């Protein structure tokens, strides 16, 4: 069964590119990472930093999670990310996304030993 740490890598890590390389990136990646299987995931963020750098955020500034949990951490540096947002024209199973590049601090919830991101909470 997929671990929470491996789910976070599948849903939110793309160290392969430094930024979204085209206007189709979210359409391709949302489908490729299985985020459009049973419905269109409405929003999702991909992080274009090394797995090591994103895992290190769990050692950085501790902040509250949006759901009230207190095991979230905010990256000390901005990171290259891509925000994926379903378009008004998207109809499952033909899910369609707007791709927007950003450079923002990320906030993740961390769990486990090793203590690693298991949830992407926000970017600021």
């Amino acid at each position, epitope marked *: 069964k997929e671990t929470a740490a491996a789910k976070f890598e599948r849903q939110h890590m793309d160290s392969s590119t430094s930024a979204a390389s085209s206007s189709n990136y979210c359409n391709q990646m949302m489908k490729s990472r299985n985020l459009t299987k049973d419905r269109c995931k409405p929003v999702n963020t991909f992080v274009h930093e090394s797995l090591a750098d994103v895992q290190a955020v769990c*050692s950085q500034k501790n902040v509250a999670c949006k759901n009230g*949990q*207190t*095991n979230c951490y905010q990256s000390y540096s901005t990171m290259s990310i891509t925000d994926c947002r379903e378009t008004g024209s998207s109809k499952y199973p033909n899910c369609a996304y707007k791709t927007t590049q950003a450079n923002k601090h990320i906030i993740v919830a*961390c*769990e486990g*030993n090793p*203590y690693v991101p298991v949830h992407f909470d926000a970017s600021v």
Partner: nanobody
Amino acid sequence: QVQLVESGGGLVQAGGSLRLSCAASGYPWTYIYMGWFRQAPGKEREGVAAMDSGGGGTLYADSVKGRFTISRDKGKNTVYLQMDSLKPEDTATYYCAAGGDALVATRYGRWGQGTQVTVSS
């Protein structure tokens, strides 16, 4: 990286008291939650008490509620456990934990090496 320096463990008889102390060193920000966990020989590790860096939001394990009192220096990465009315069932290694959520061990990222507490009959 960060060190959680623990002190205050010892050996006492049932009914006695002990005080555990923990200070996190080298963290540039403030751990919102810090707390105490314990692990007895053969048993699963369990949350004992936790609280937020403002001095509130205290949480206690059902078995220590009324006997143990957690405190912190407000706004600082310290946490303390006053342990009174000690029972043999409280014998365990006690661990400070920093940067986590409620008493959910897997949600805490920094752990001390542990301080042994032994309560005799």
